[PDB]
Symmetry: C7
Subunit: 280 residues, 7 copies
C-alpha cells in the first residue's frame, strides 16, 4: 500500500511519540442477555490536526435459540436469532464526527470454468460443452450498514445453513410438501412436535451460543472546540424469527416468519476530551 | 523489488528523519448520501527535490438500491448503483502535479488445461480431446481511469452477479422469453410487481450498503514556487440504472436501461504548502 | 486491523513500559484425573483506567475411554467422553468483571459449485445439471458458551467420527439392523462383546488420551475499589456417554445413551490485587 | 539467497550509512497521452567502487481503445494498443554504463499429468490411457527486451484474451466463416457496424484505461571520470492495431492488421553526478 | 492469541531481563540402541512466583527392523518397531510439579463433499446422488499420553502404511487367502522366506532408521521449599512386533503378533535448583 | 535450520561487525551480444580463518533467435539457443579455492494417486482400477554442473515447450509424417518456408530475448599466503541449434540438429586481496 | 514451539553475548571427484555447561553417470550413482560426544478419499463405491542413518524415477519381455547398444551432475577435560550400480545389479578446543 508509492512504511501513519490513554467499560444487560464492552483509546498527536478516539465495540449478543411455546403434540414454535446489530449513534447537536470504521464492505468473487470436449468412437463423433461456477457462502454475513457523519452501524444477517449434510436452506426456501425445512430434524417423524427441532449443537454456533462483535470507529473532534465534551449512544440488538412446525397428518410442515421480535440494549457514554476519559 | 538489485531494502524510499504533518477532513453530503473523508499528509524531506502530499480519498458512497416507483401490480422499477467513481482534479492554472497513485491497473490471468484420452473396449477404440479454461470474476471491477498531469480518477463498475445460485447475469444479458433477469426474484411469480425484486441481502453488499473507497494520490510541488498555495477539487459520484420489470400475461420480463441518473458531490480544498495544512 | 485505520500498529494496545507479575498454580485431581493449571498475569498500566488480570486456563482433562462393565459374552458397555467443559465463575458479590475472552465463536463457511453440461451424439442431445457443496467437519467443536458479567465458560462437544474409514457416525445416527455403530469394531463378529469395541488408537486422540485446554479470560477491577480482593472459582468437567452393544443372534447392535455421567472438579482461588498475587 | 552461503543477511548489500538524494520528475505528453515520471536516487557509498543512480520509470501509457473510423453501416474500424514499450537509451559517447535492471525474463512452467485406467464389466475388459497438461496464460506479457551496455528496454505485448467467456483469441486467430473474432460483440448481429464492438469494460483493463510501468535501471559511473555529467533519453511508446469488421451479407467478418500506428514520446534528462541531481 | 485481547504481544510471556543457565547431557545405551539427550534450561524470573526448568527430551530411538530368525525356506520372522515411547516420571516424594508440556493432542478434521446431478437424454431422465469424504493419514501418530502432576509421557504408534503403492495396511488387517500382508514383498513368490520381506528403504524411515524425539516439559518448584533438590527419571522405550510369514504350498501367508518385546532405557537425573545445574 | 539445534538464529553466520568492500564491473561483448556484470564483495572477518570474496555473476546472454538462412520457398533454417552456460575458472597455479556456490541441484518430486472403484447395475458388477501421476516441467532447467576446487559452472538447458497450446515438443521428438514440429507454425501451410516459423513472442521468452544469470561463488584465500593476488577467468556462452524445415510436396517436415554453433565470451579479472579490489 | 509454553521466543536458545570463531576447510578428491568442505563454528557460552562445535558438512559428490564399457553393438553397460553417503565418525577413545544433528527422520503422510454414489435411470438403480489414495514420491530420499554417541551419518538413496513421462521405475522393477527399463531410451530401437541409454539431461539432476550435502552435527566437550583435543574423521562415498542392456533379437532387455562399486573419501581433522580452531 504505502510502500508502493516509494514512501517508507509507516511514514503516513499516526500515533508516534505520543501517549494514548486507553480504557475499558463493561456492562451486562441481564434482561436481553447482551454482554457489552466499549474499549476506547484517546490518541493525541501534536502533528494531527484533530484529536482522535477509537471505540472498540467488543462484547457478546447471546443467541437465544429455544422453543418458546408448544401447543399440543402437533404444533410447536422456535425463536432463533435472525440478525445481530451494533449501532453507534452520535447526537446531531455535537460537533465531533465519525472519521473511519472497520470492517467495511468487500467485493465478492467467483470462479468460472468452461469445457469443450469432443471425441470419436470405433463413427459416433460426439461433442460436449459445459461450464461450472463456484463460490463460497458464509453462514452469516457481516454487512456494514451505510454510515453517515453522526451514525455508523453494522449487522450480521443469516445467509443460509446446511441441515444434516442435506441442502443449503434459507429463510425464503419453500417446498410444497414439507414447507421450509430449515430446522426440521425429521420429515416423517413420529415424535412430539416440541422435540422435532434440530439440536443446537448441530446448527451453527452463532444461533445458540451468540455472536461476539469486534468493530472499530474512530471519531475526531476539532481541537479548538468551544466545549470539549460529547455524549455517545451505542445500541446492540438482535432480531428473532418465529419458526413454526406442525403435522399435516402425513408429514411435518414448517413455516418461518421474518422479524418477529427485536430487543435493543442502548447505553449512553459521556466523553471528556480534556480529561481524556469517558464514563458509563 | 529493491533488494533484487543488491540495494538494501528501504534505501531508495523517502520520509526518513523527517516530520510529516498528517490531518483529516470529514464531510457528509446528505442530499446524495456520500460520506467523505480526505486524510492527507505533508512529507517534507530535505533530500527530496520536491515537496510531497499524499491524499487518501477514503469515505463511503451509499448504494441507494430501492424501488423508485410502481405503476400498478403489473409494472415496477428499480434504481441500482451501476458504478461508483472518485475523481481528483487540479486546476490547470496551478503548478503542482500529481506524482503517483494507487491502486493501478493489473494484468489478468487465466488457466488453460488440455486433455487427450484414448481407450479400448473388449474392438471399439475411441479417442477423446478436450480443453478447459478457468478464471475468476469479481462482482465489481476497480478500474483506474487514465490519469493525466492534473487529473486522476478511479471507477468501480458492475461486472456481473449470480442470481439465486443460477447464472452470472450482467447489464447486457438478454433472454427472449424473460428478458434481463438480473434482479428478478421469480420467473412465473404471482405477486405484485413491486414485491418481485431480489432481496437486497441476497444481492452483493455494494449494491445496497454502499462502497467505501481507499485511494491515494501523491502530488508534488516545486520547492521554489512563486506562490505556495494550490486548491484542489475532489468529486464523488455514483451512476444508477433503471431496472424495470412487467408482466407479459404469462411470465415476468425485465429490462435494464444503462446510466439513467448520475449524482456528483464536489468539494474544493485549499492547500497551504508553507503552513503544511489544507482546509475545507 | 488497527493499521487499516491509519493508526500505527500497536498504538492502541496496552502493557507498554509496565511490569507484569506473572505466576503459575498447578493442581491434580486424582479422583477425576484432571490436571489443572491456572497461569495468570497482573498487568498494571498507569494509562489504563482499570487493573487487569489474564487467566490462562491450561491443563488436561483425561479422556477416560474404557469398558466399564461386561455382562456375559453377549453384552458389554463403554464409557467415552462426550464433552469437556471449562467454566470460570465469579461471585456476584464481587465488583470485578470479566473483560474479554478467547477463543470465541466463529462463522462457518461452505463452497457451492454448480454445473451445466449439454452434449450431442452422432441425434441424442442430452442435458446435465448438477451442484456440489463441500465443507470441513472437525471431530470436536470448541464452542464458547454464552458469557455474562461474572461467568464465562467453554465446552468441547463431539461432532462425529469416521469408523474404520467407513462413514461419519455421530451420537444420533441409527441403522435399523445394526443400531448406532459409532465404536463397533465388527458387524458380524464372533468375539466376546467386551472385545468388540474400536481400538482406542483407531479412535480420535481426545477420546482416550484427553483434551488439554488453552483459554484466556481477562478480568478488570476498578482502581479505587473499597476492597482489593476477590475470590474466583474455576470448574473443569467431562461428560461421559454409555455405549452399549449386544448380540441379536445374527449381528451386533449398538445403542448410545447421552450424558450418563458428569464429574466436576472445582477449585477456588483468592486474588490479591494490592499484592499482585493469587493463591490456591 | 545470501543466507544460504552462511553469510549474514544484508551483508553484501549496499547503501549502508550513506545518504541517498532522491528526486522526482513528472511530464505529461498531451499529444500522445503518456503521463511520465522518472523517480531517481543517487546512492553514494564510500565502500562501493562506482557511484549509483537507480531510475524508476513509473508513469502511465493511455490505452487509446476507440473506433477510429466508420464507413457506412457495413464497415467500421477499431484501434487498440497492441504493445506498450519503455526504452532507456544512453549516448554511446558517455562513459556511464547500465548496471542492472528489474524485472527480468523468467522461466515458464507447466504441469503434466498422466492416467492409466483399466476396468472389467460383468467379460468386457477395457483400457484407458490419457494425459493432461495445464499452465497459466497472462493477457499481457512483460518481456525484457535484450539489454546492452548503453540501452535497456521493456515491452508489454498482447498474449490473448477471452471474449465473452468464449474462446481465448489472439491476433493470429482465424475462422473461415467469421474471421478473427477478437473484439466481435455479436456474430449474427443486426446493428450498425460501429456499434458491434466489444464494450471496453468487458475487455481487459489495459486495453482502454492504460498500462502503468514500474521498471528500474541502476547506472554506474566511474568515480574518477574526467567529466561527471551524462544525458539520458527515455522513450515511451505504444503500438496500435487496426481491427476492421464488415458484413458479408450473412454474418460479420473481422480482420486484424498488426502494427498499424506507433507513437513515441522521447524526453532527454541531464544527469549531474557532482551535484547529485538530474533535471528535465 | 495474546494480541487479540488488546494486550501487546509478548507482554504476558516470561523470561525477560533474566539469565537462563542452559545445559546438555548426552547418553548412549548400546544394549538397546537409544541415543539420549536431555537439553535443559533454568529460567529464573523475579516476577514469576516459581522457578522454572524446561526439559528438552531430544535423542534417537533406533528402529531395529531386521529378520530375527528363520526356520527353513518356508518360515521366517521379522521384528519391527510398533511404537516408540518417552516418559518423564518424577518421584511422588518431591514437591516439584510438571507445569506444561508440548506437543499436545490436537483435534482432527475431515472434508465432506456432496453431489446431486440429474440429466436428460434425447426421455431417459436420470438422477445421481453421491458424497465423498477425505482426510489425511500419518504413518505414525504422536499421541500425548494423559499427564498427571508427577508424570508426563508421549508415544508414537503405527497408524498404517502403503505396501508398494498398493493398499494401506495396518496391524489389524486380515485377508483370508494371504493373511496380513503388511511387509510381504511378493504374494506368489518363489524365493526363500527370509528374503521375502519388504526392503527397509521401501518402508517408512522410522521403521529401520529410528525416531528422534523433540518434546518439552517445564517443571516448576516452590521458591521457599525446604530442600531445593529433586531427582528425575526419564524413560525411553520401543515396542517391537513379531511379523511371521510362511508358505501354504500355494502362496505366502503372513501374521502379525502385537507387543512381543519391549525394551526400556531408564536414566535418573539429579536437579540442583540452588546451583542451577542437573547432573547425570 | 540453525534454530532447530537450539542455537540462536544467525549465531553461526559470518560478516558481523566488519566492513565489506563491494564493487561492480560491467562489460559488453558486442560480437556475441553478452552483457556481463561481476558484482563482488570482500568480506573480512577477524573471527573467520580465511578471507572471503563472493562473486555475483549477473548479466544477460541474448537469445539470438532468428532465421539464419533461406534457400528458396521450400527450405529454410532457424538458429535458436539450445543452452546458456556460465563458467568461473581459476588457474590451478593459484592457492585460492572456491568455497561455496548457489544455486545447487535439487531433488525432484512427483505425486502418485491410485483409484479402486467397483459398482453394480440394476447384475452387471464392474471393477475399475487406475493410477495417475503428475509433476511440473520447467521450460529451461538450471543445472549446476559438477564443481571442483578451481572450477565451478552452471548451465541452463532446454527441457521442452508447448507449441500453440498443442503438445510438449522437445529436441528429440519425432513424428514420421511431420518430423520434429518444435517451431512449426503450420503443418499444411502454403506460405514461404522462411515465414513458417513460430512467432518469437509465442515461444518462451528465453529463446529470443535472452537469459539473465544470477549465480554466486564465494572463494576463500589463506590469510598468510605468500602472495595475496589471484586472477580469475569467467566464461559465458550459448549453444545454438539448427532447426531446418522443408516441404515434402504434401506437408512441412522439420528436423533439428543439436549443438551446431557455440560462442564463448571469456574475460580475465585480477584480484588484489590486500587492496580489496579486483579490476577488469 | 517455545512460545507455546508462555516462554519468550529465544529465551532457551544459546549463543547470546558470546563470540563464535567460525572457519572453513576445503578439499578436493580428484580420484573420486568429491568436493569437500567442512565449515565449522566454536560456540562458547559461559552459561552453557559444555563447549560446542557445529560441523557443517557441505560439499559435492559428483554423480558419475556414464557408459563404462561396451561389448559390440548388442551389449553395453552403465554405472550410475545408487546412493550418496556422508558419515562423521569420532574415535571411541575421545570424550567428546555428538550432541545433535539435522536433518532428521520425518513422518510420512497420505490422503485417503472415499466415494459412495448411487443413481437411478429412466428402473436401473446402480450403486458405486470407490476410494482413492495419494502421496508424493521424491526421486531421492534423505535418510538419517541411526546415530550413536560417536558416529552419525546420512544417506541419500534412489527412490524411483519417471522415464520419458512413462512409468515410475525403480531398481527392483521387472517386466518379463523388456526387463528393467529404468534407463532404456527405446524399446524396439535399432541403434548401437552404447547409444540406447537415457540422455543424462532427461534423467534427474543428481544422477549426472552430483549431490551437494548440507548437514550439521554439533559436538560438545566437557569443559574440565584433561586434554582439550580430539580428532574427527568425516567420510563421503557414493555407491554405483551396473545397468546392463542387450538385444534379445526382438527387443532390448535391461538388467540392474545393485551396489557394484563404492568409493570412499576419508579425511581426518584435528580439533583444538583451547585455541578454537581445527585443521586439515
Ligand atoms: C471403499 C470406500 C469406503 O470405504 O467408503 C466409505 C464411505 C461409504 O459409506 P458407508 O456405507 O457408510 O461405508 C461403508 C464402507 N465399507 C465398505 C468400508 C464398509 O464413504 C462415505 O461415506 C463418503
Ligand atoms: C458454455 C460453455 C463456454 O463458455 O464455452 C466457452 C468455450 C467453448 O468453445 P468456443 O467455441 O471457443 O466458445 C463458443 C461457445 N459459446 C459461444 C456458446 C460460449 O470454451 C473454451 O474455448 C475452452
Amino acid at each position: 500500500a504505502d510502500s508502493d508509492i516509494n514512501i517508507k512504511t509507516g511514514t503516513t501513519d499516526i500515533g508516534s511519540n505520543t501517549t494514548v490513554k486507553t480504557g475499558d467499560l463493561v456492562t451486562y444487560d441481564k434482561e436481553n442477555g447482551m454482554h457489552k464492552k466499549v474499549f476506547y483509546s484517546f490518541i493525541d498527536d501534536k502533528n494531527h490536526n484533530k484529536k482522535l478516539l477509537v471505540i472498540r465495540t467488543k462484547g457478546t449478543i447471546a443467541g437465544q435459540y429455544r422453543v418458546y411455546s408448544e401447543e399440543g403434540a402437533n404444533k410447536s414454535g422456535l425463536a432463533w436469532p435472525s440478525a445481530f446489530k451494533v449501532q453507534l449513534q452520535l447526537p446531531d447537536n455535537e460537533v465531533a464526527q465519525i472519521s473511519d470504521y472497520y470492517p467495511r464492505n468487500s467485493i465478492d468473487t467467483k470462479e468460472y470454468m468452461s469445457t469443450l470436449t469432443y471425441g470419436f468412437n470405433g463413427i459416433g463423433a460426439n461433442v460436449s460443452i459445459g461450464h461450472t461456477l463456484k463460490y463460497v457462502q458464509p453462514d452469516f454475513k457481516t454487512i456494514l450498514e451505510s454510515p453517515t457523519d453522526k451514525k455508523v452501524g453494522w449487522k450480521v444477517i443469516f445467509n443460509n445453513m446446511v441441515n444434516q449434510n442435506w441442502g443449503p436452506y434459507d429463510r425464503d426456501s419453500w417446498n410444497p410438501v414439507y414447507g421450509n425445512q430449515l430446522f426440521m430434524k425429521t420429515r416423517n417423524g413420529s415424535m412430539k412436535a416440541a422435540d422435532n427441532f434440530l439440536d443446537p449443537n448441530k446448527a451453527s454456533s452463532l444461533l445458540s451460543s451468540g455472536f461476539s462483535p469486534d468493530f472499530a470507529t474512530v471519531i475526531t473532534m476539532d481541537r479548538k472546540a468551544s466545549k470539549q465534551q460529547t455524549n455517545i449512544d451505542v445500541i446492540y440488538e438482535r432480531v428473532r424469527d418465529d419458526y413454526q412446525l406442525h403435522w399435516t397428518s402425513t408429514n411435518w410442515k414448517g413455516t418461518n416468519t421474518k422479524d418477529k421480535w427485536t430487543d435493543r440494549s442502548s447505553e449512553r457514554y459521556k466523553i471528556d476530551w480534556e480529561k481524556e476519559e469517558m464514563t458509563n
